[PDB]
Amino acid sequence: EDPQLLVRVRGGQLRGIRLKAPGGPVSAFLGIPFAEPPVGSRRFMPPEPKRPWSGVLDATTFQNVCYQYVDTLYPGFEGTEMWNPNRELSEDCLYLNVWTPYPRPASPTPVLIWIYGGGFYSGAASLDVYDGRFLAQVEGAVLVSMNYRVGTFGFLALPGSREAPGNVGLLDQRLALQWVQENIAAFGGDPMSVTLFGESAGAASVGMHILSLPSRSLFHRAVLQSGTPNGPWATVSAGEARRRATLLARLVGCPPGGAGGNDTELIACLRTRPAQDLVDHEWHVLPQESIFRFSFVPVVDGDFLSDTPEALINTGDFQDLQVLVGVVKDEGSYFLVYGVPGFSKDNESLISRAQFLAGVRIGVPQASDLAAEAVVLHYTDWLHPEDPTHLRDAMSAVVGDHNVVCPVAQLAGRLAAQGARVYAYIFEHRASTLTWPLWMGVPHGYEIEFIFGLPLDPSLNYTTEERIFAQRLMKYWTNFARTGDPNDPRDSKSPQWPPYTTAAQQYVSLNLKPLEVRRGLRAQTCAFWNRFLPKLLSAT
């Protein structure tokens, strides 16, 4: 028995597996359970702390993926399939993962926690691109990641019921976080240096921990990659949530025979439905044809979030908060091929003007005709109104600016203005090994592999500079994790990454070239989306 690979946590004993990162060893504790499995009558309920077990629990592989819809967009293609579940689907899925260096470190080392995204309807911590060997090996970090319930299981809500209260997916994350307070010391990590980081819904989730009081004392610093809690997709109102829950139920059994008294009678019936029945109907509840909108997402309940994220980033006190936030170069491109007519990976998607107008209604489902028109106005080249290249790229900026870029800038701006230290970036590097067309640029989420150090592992066939690049990234992230500043703490010329400020609006390019400072993250456009358009949507 290897004493490194065996740890005791408050619930009992665990056995890790020794892992061979390309520059030496690491200890992995995979599949540690942090909650009672939320099944049977616990479906839709807040998670409960895992009861203590006896014996030695085998922590040597990834546990089940939380039950979820699986995209069938391009069956067979690694571009999409790299993102699909890689373990069996199960409602029994509340498990986290821990990576420490081998051997267990020196003194209390800074802790990174990953929260995966996927529109709150998909994702798994067990994915290749989220493998924490490298950050732990190469930078001596303790890297934690958890599974949390998605779709209906995590976010179906009958607001104000005891029984399907909403936001239980975030409660899952909050429980994994509490577990790190209580247990990470045992692996080397430091409970007083905890940094969150996530991408998409993962970032929106980090956002939400920033915004929810009971979460604040469980972490110190935060990274939001390509996603924010404010913005058009990451929350719904209590009333739209009830509408969606009630309609979902009605379509499966639920309650039986048009009966509408007890919300708990409604939920009891839903708990009798096979998991696949729920997933089978989850898309049917959206209110219009759209993209970048998801059926079951965090709800503004007056509870986990005491007001909307918009209201809560305006009025917050954020003195003691260091944050790092950014976007990739082409946030919008995946979304088009996913759900706007005219866009594919197989041709190169030079659309007509009609397609672009139709695309704007799909990309901006909440828009009235006048709002839709405002959007067309800003994004059209009135000199070349039908240049199919311009149209294609424009349609991509609409979706990416509306959903990601501008809410990131809004977030950066409000946090800076309310006392936070904020660093911002834009990721413009396109991987040599990417298999999506050139027209798609750097799409949503293809910075993850470089933050995670995957271009290390040389059997992946990442170029030599991609490798150096990855190491820079890993430095910035872990630097930020340690200090609240991604800059090298004594570095002779690099240069600096300055804080983002409302006054100067500085943010850095992240590519193969050295760090370049820029000013105004799509400033004119974000003024359109963040100040003007809301005024025009309401009143219209």
Ligand X SMILES: Nc1c2c(nc3cc(Cl)ccc13)C[C@H]1C=C(CCCCn3cc(CO)nn3)C[C@@H]2C1
Ligand Y SMILES: CC(=O)N[C@@H]1[C@@H](O)[C@H](O)[C@@H](CO)O[C@H]1O
Residue 517 binds its own copies (CB under 8 A) = no
Residue 443 binds ligand X (CB under 6 A) = yes
In whole angstroms, what is the distance from residue 266 CA to residue 281 CA?
Answer: 16
Q: What share of the chain is helix, strand, coil (3-state, %, to 5)?
A: 35, 20, 45
- Please work out the total of residues on this chain that contact its own copies, with binding judged by CB under 8 A: 22
Q: Residue 11 in contact with residue 70, Cβ under 8 Å?
A: no
- Please work out the total of residues on this chain that contact Cl ion, with binding judged by CB under 5 A: 1
Catalytic residue among 282, 331, 449, 466: 331
Query: What radius of gyration do the chain's Cα atoms show?
Result: 23
Among residues 86 and 262, whose Cβ is nearest to ligand Y? Answer: 262
Query: For ligand X, which residue of 291, 299, 406, 470 counts as binding (CB under 6 A)?
Result: 291
331 in active site: yes
* Binding site partner of 382, from its own copies, ligand Y, ligand X, none, Cβ cut-off 5-8 A by kind: its own copies
Largest CA distance in the chain: 73
Catalytic residue among 200, 205, 212, 349: 200
Nearest to residue 422, comparing CAs of 329, 525, 316, 343? 316
In the stretch 326-365, what mask flags binding to ligand X with x, by CB under 6 A? Answer: --------xx--xx--------------------------
Among residues 379 and 469, whose Cβ is nearest to its own copies? Answer: 379
402 in active site: no
> How near is the Cβ of 380 to ligand Y at its closest, in Å?
56
* Binding site partner of 518, from Cl ion, its own copies, ligand X, none, Cβ cut-off 5-8 A by kind: Cl ion
Cα 394 to the chain's mean position, in Å? Answer: 25
The H or E element spanning position 205 is helix 201-211
State whether the Cα torsion 33-138-207-374 is positive or negative.
negative
Per DSSP, the three-state class of 423 is strand
- Please work out the total of residues on this chain that contact ligand Y, with binding judged by CB under 6 A: 3
Query: For its own copies, which residue of 280, 373, 387, 428 counts as binding (CB under 8 A)?
Result: 373
Among residues 343 and 497, whose Cβ is nearest to ligand X? Answer: 343
Interface with its own copies in residues 494-513 (CB under 8 A):
505
State whether the Cα torsion 156-158-159-165 is positive or negative.
negative
Question: Left if phi > 0, otherwise alpha if psi is -120 to 50, otherwise beta: which for 302?
Answer: left
Q: DSSP secondary structure string, 320-352? A: T-EEEEEEETBTTHHHHHHHSTT--SSS-----
Among residues 307 and 381, whose Cβ is nearest to its own copies? Answer: 381
Residue 384 binds Cl ion (CB under 5 A) = no
The H or E element spanning position 372 is helix 369-379
Q: Residue 335 in contact with residue 233, Cβ under 8 Å?
A: no
In the stretch 228-267, what mask flags binding to ligand Y with x, by CB under 6 A? Answer: ----------------------------------x-xx--
* Binding site partner of 380, from Cl ion, its own copies, ligand Y, none, Cβ cut-off 5-8 A by kind: its own copies
Catalytic residue among 209, 220, 429, 444: 444
* Window of 170-178, 264-272, 381-389, 435-443 that interacts with its own copies by CB under 8 A: 381-389
* Window of 115-123, 247-255, 269-277, 350-358 that interacts with ligand X by CB under 6 A: 115-123
200 in active site: yes
Query: For ligand X, which residue of 11, 38, 47, 117 counts as binding (CB under 6 A)?
Result: 117
Query: For ligand X, which residue of 83, 134, 462, 469 counts as binding (CB under 6 A)?
Result: 83
* Binding site partner of 117, from its own copies, ligand X, Cl ion, none, Cβ cut-off 5-8 A by kind: ligand X
Residue 383 binds its own copies (CB under 8 A) = yes
Per DSSP, the three-state class of 393 is helix
In the stretch 449-488, what mask flags binding to its own copies with x, by CB under 8 A? Answer: ----------------------------------------
Per DSSP, the three-state class of 487 is coil
In whole angstroms, what is the distance from residue 472 CA to residue 494 CA?
Answer: 11
Backbone φ, ψ for residue 538 (5° rounding):
-65, 150
H helices of 156-237, in order, are: 168-183, 201-211, 213-216
Q: 90 pairs with which residues across the strands? A: 66
Instruction: Enter the tokens of residue 412.
Output: 């950066």
Q: Residue 447 in contact with residue 350, Cβ under 8 Å?
A: no
After what residues is the chain interrupted, C–N > 2.5 A?
Answer: none
Residue 441 binds ligand X (CB under 6 A) = no
- The residues annotated as belonging to the active site are 200, 331, 444
- In the complex, which residues of this chain contact Cl ion (CB under 5 A)? 518
- In the complex, which residues of this chain contact its own copies (CB under 8 A)? 370, 373-374, 377, 380-383, 505, 519-520, 523-524, 526-528, 531-532, 535-536, 539-540
